[PDB]
Design a protein around this ligand. Structure first.
Ligand SMILES: Nc1ncnc2c1ncn2[C@@H]1O[C@H](COP(=O)(O)OP(=O)(O)OP(=O)(O)O)[C@@H](O)[C@H]1O
Lengths: 393, 55, 396, 88
């Protein structure tokens, strides 16, 4: 319809996705972090950072670009990252093409602070011809053809739950669990460390391991128990007295040491259970912090923010299971089970894109999608006048 | 052999240009560059093939 | 449509470019034109510039539009291209008085696109195709895409593109190119020469270069049965050499495999990833060196094959010796394999397949230009409808 | 108030409507290359078939010439092998 195309940038907590609105797949995806070298040198790029890791130069440091809130952290570095993309991946002056970016749903408290900083970057530093920012979970629901949706972000750096009612992000009901991908990565590392040779530059290496073999492990070794592992285990023992798959072994080669690691099914399940029963992690966590009750909490809070009976029937029939972590086999079904436990009186309808690729970049695809609408004026497009207004006294 | 006229003979049409453009509903306070249907030296010689043939 | 003799396929590269105007109708053949990718630039009063096929009055500068596969000066590039197109126009026009009554009438243009070109680069290029060369039939194929047809069409496969100063790593999944994984290494055939110079610092660079080209040079794993052998120089000299003729390749190969592993490890659908690993395709002039492809396979094999680590396997066997079921893993690849070549192109069979990517383009070219629909290319109409942007309507 | 919500509701309605439109309209990079492969394969079938016919025709012509008086080279090296056995 319209004579345009644009740059879409999604600063995820782990992956930064960027590309052109012209295409289905992103132009490139790089880690949302960088290597600082010393004079001041900034390394961006998946392979580049890997090569830097291979160098193992003293003084190299890993810094992330996104904080716990899903917001930009080191703004000066952010400039450098985007600059990098414009020069080496997009390969176009930031002044010529339009820029659409996004962010996760928040409670609204930092909205103004973030926009100020973006106006400084986009306009004061990059002279971006036009600027827009959108909400990721909102975009996802919209790409699914949903006006109302229960967005379940089983991703890294925490689990986001966003109740969307009639195109409304219920900010009061939006919750951000501290548990997610990153947590599990930590646990995997710690649980497998007992089988690995020995059991900050070091932290740069941690990043390397996280970006490599750890990610490989979690892609296939983890699996989510259908039922509550504890009860399910008991069940099988009962049945044994009256086959029990929990004893089944799985194999995984530890590439860097060339050795076979072997785990049973139960152990794989044990990792998954941390997202449902965090009180099994330690005494610092409450049963309510598991995804089951967190979801219920956010559902109920959503009801509180506006006819609970209808709200529950609405959200529970528009459930979107997404985020990269959601790809762990069985996760989807387990979510369904948890929902039926806490809402046994409601029919559940969930959605999940079977294509792995689509989920991994779904947030970007959502942004992509919104960026491609013909009624230009629907967005809150920003210009220098908005930066000016902000700074005008 | 004038290569330009060879072009005019070969393969026998609105041109576009890359330039600034202002969005409108009305007009919005911003502009961007794109391929606009526009308003409406060279190599100078010809390469001696036979020198560039696989023989 | 379309006349076989009017279909123009152009393949650019960092060194030279292949041009093949017209097809062989019955069969496919190896591109007969080869033109050095260089053009001269004269600086005139106040920086005004001209372009030349030669160095007019020894004042023009040597310009190389393409560097490591990437266009670094699109102005120069389109001038280079222009020169080529009109060169073949005048060539045929002189060879055939009635050329514009037939073969120089409707000319299909297939340009092979190196993945490094930007979105804006591509736009400008299509602009010149229609507004400078006035060509009413344009396809800008992904080079990797062309390659996937040549290997009897593959759904899941890898393209290893060996250049001279760079090597490109491409993964194809479901026939699509995974752009966010596609990368490139700043190493190529020249690095072989560099290491050979290091190895034999007393040799002339040409001795080294011509040796690389020579059949005595080989990647190992009957000149291999001799301690010494010889090769005739460009000047007719007899060059004698020992086992150094089998050296200088591992550095390149190792770096290739490093990125191959890293790239393929990021494929999301492991079922498809498994399929990808069983179809590896190797292309590039340097890959013509005997044994190269096999060595590359071998290096990839030993560094990625999922198989019970040597000793552990022997421990299964050891304990058995006192049948063990296959020790399956959730990982991949379990099978690493090179893709199978087509046996239906004798000409190319005879020439070798280092330039097979052109063949793939040739094959799909007749598939496209004998088809009743124009679904996959830019017409003057489409160009009029979208401008340069039309490319992303037909983008492959 | 009421109409403000209705505005929002229709705004997001139209957003979804444009999205679901494009879901059926778009046809993406992958769609092109997938169709090209299906297309190319049929080209190979016809072109491949033609090549086979040409090879057969050449073989037939050679056979006819012999009567009047891969394997085309295998028989040369085979008969040359045997020729050499007789030459030696
Ligand atoms: N095969 C896999 N299955 C499940 N999870 C995976 C897989 N591969 C990677 N992950 C996890 O997915 C993470 C990236 O996912 P994702 O981009 O959804 O998180 P994120 O988008 O950064 O989080 P946010 O959505 O808050 O930005 C990686 O950190 C990795 O830990």
């Amino acid at each position: 319809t319209l004579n345009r195309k644009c740059v879409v940038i999604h600063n995820g907590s782990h992956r930064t996705v960027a590309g052109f609105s012209n295409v289905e797949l992103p132009q490139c995806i790089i880690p949302s972090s960088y290597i600082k070298r010393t004079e001041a040198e900034f390394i961006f790029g998946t392979y580049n950072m890997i090569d830097a890791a291979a160098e193992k130069r003293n003084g190299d440091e890993v810094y992330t670009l996104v904080d716990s809130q899903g917001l930009p952290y080191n703004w000066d570095a952010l400039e450098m990252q985007w600059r990098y993309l414009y020069d080496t991946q997009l390969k176009v002056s930031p002044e010529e093409l339009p820029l659409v970016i996004t962010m996760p749903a928040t409670n609204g408290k930092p909205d103004m602070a973030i926009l100020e900083r973006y106006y400084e970057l986009a306009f004061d530093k990059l002279n971006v011809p036009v600027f827009q920012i959108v909400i990721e979970p909102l975009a996802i629901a919209l790409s699914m053809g949903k006006s109302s949706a229960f967005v379940i972000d089983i991703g890294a750096s925490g689990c986001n739950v966003t109740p969307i009612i009639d195109g409304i992000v219920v900010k009061n009901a939006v919750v951000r669990s501290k548990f997610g991908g990153d947590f599990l990565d930590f646990q995997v590392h710690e649980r497998l460390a007992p089988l690995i040779k020995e059991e900050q530059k070091r932290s740069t290496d941690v990043w390397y391991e996280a970006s490599t073999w750890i990610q490989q492990f979690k892609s296939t070794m983890l699996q989510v128990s259908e039922k509550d592992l504890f009860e399910l285990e008991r069940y099988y023992k009962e049945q044994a007295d009256i086959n029990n798959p929990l004893v089944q072994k799985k194999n995984f080669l530890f590439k860097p040491l060339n050795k076979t690691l072997t785990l049973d099914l139960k152990e794989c399940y044990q990792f998954a259970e941390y997202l449902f029963k965090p009180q099994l992690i330690s005494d610092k966590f409450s049963p309510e912090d598991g995804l089951g009750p967190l979801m219920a909490k956010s559902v109920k809070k959503a009801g509180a923010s506006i006819s609970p009976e209808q709200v529950y029937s609405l959200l529970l029939t528009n459930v979107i299971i997404t985020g990269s972590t959601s790809l762990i086999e069985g996760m989807e079904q387990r979510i369904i089970k948890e929902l039926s436990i806490r809402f046994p009186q409601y029919k559940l309808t969930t959605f999940a894109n079977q294509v792995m690729m689509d989920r991994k970049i779904q947030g970007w695809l959502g942004a992509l999608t919104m960026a491609n609408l013909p009624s230009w004026s629907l967005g809150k497009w920003y210009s220098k006048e908005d930066y000016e207004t902000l700074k005008r006294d | 052999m004038d290569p330009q006229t060879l072009i005019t003979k070969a393969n026998k049409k609105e041109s576009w240009r890359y330039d600034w453009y202002q969005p409108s509903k009305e007009k919005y306070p911003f502009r961007y560059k794109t391929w606009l249907r526009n308003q409406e030296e060279s190599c100078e010689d010809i390469l001696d093939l036979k020198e560039f043939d696989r023989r | 449509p379309f006349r076989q003799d009017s279909i123009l396929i152009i393949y650019p590269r960092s060194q030279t470019t292949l041009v093949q105007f017209g097809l062989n109708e019955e069969t496919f053949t190896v591109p007969e034109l080869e033109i050095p990718t260089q053009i001269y630039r004269t600086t005139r009063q106040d920086g005004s510039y001209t372009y030349h096929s030669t160095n007019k009055d020894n004042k023009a500068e040597l310009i190389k539009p393409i560097q490591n596969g990437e266009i670094i000066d699109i102005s120069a590039f389109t001038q280079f291209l222009r020169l080529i197109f009109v060169s073949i126009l005048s060539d045929r026009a002189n060879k055939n008085q009635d050329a514009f009554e037939a073969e120089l009438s409707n000319i299909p243009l297939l340009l092979i696109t190196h993945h490094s070109w930007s979105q804006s680069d591509l736009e400008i290029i299509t602009q010149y195709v229609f507004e400078s060369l006035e060509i009413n039939n344009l396809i800008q194929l992904p080079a990797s895409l062309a390659a996937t047809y040549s290997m009897i069409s593959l759904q899941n496969c890898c393209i290893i593109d060996v250049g001279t100063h760079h090597t490109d790593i491409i993964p194809i999944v479901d026939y699509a190119q995974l752009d966010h994984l596609v990368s490139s290494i700043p190493m190529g055939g020249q690095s072989i020469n560099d290491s050979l110079k290091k190895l034999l610092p007393q040799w002339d660079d040409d001795q080294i270069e011509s040796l690389k080209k020579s059949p005595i040079f080989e990647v190992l794993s009957k000149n291999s049965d001799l301690e010494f052998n010889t090769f005739w120089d460009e000047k007719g000299n007899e060059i004698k050499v020992g086992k150094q003729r089998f050296q200088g390749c591992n550095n390149l190969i190792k770096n290739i495999s490093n990125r191959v592993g890293l790239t393929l490890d990021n494929i999301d659908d492991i079922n498809k990833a498994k399929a990808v690993w069983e179809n590896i395709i190797i292309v590039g002039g340097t890959t013509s060196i005997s044994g190269f492809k096999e060595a590359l396979l071998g290096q990839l094999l030993k560094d990625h094959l999922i198989i019970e680590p040597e000793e552990e396997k022997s421990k299964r066997e050891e304990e058995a010796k006192s049948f063990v079921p296959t020790i399956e893993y959730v990982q991949c690849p379990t099978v690493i394999k090179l893709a199978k070549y087509p046996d239906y192109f004798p000409e190319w069979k005879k020439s070798g397949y280092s330039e097979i990517i052109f063949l793939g383009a040739q094959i799909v070219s007749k598939q496209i230009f004998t088809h009743p629909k124009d679904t996959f290319y830019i017409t003057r109409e489409k160009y009029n409808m979208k401008g340069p942007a039309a490319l992303w309507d037909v983008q492959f | 108030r009421k109409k403000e919500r209705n505005l929002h509701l229709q705004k997001i309605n139209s957003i979804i409507d444009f999205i679901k439109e494009r879901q059926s309209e778009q046809w993406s990079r992958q769609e092109r290359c997938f169709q090209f492969g299906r297309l190319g394969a049929s080209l190979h079938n016809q072109m491949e078939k033609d090549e086979q016919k040409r090879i057969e025709r050449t073989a037939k012509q050679r056979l006819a010439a012999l009567k009047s008086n891969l394997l085309d080279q295998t028989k040369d090296t085979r008969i040359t092998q045997l020729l050499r056995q007789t030459n030696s």
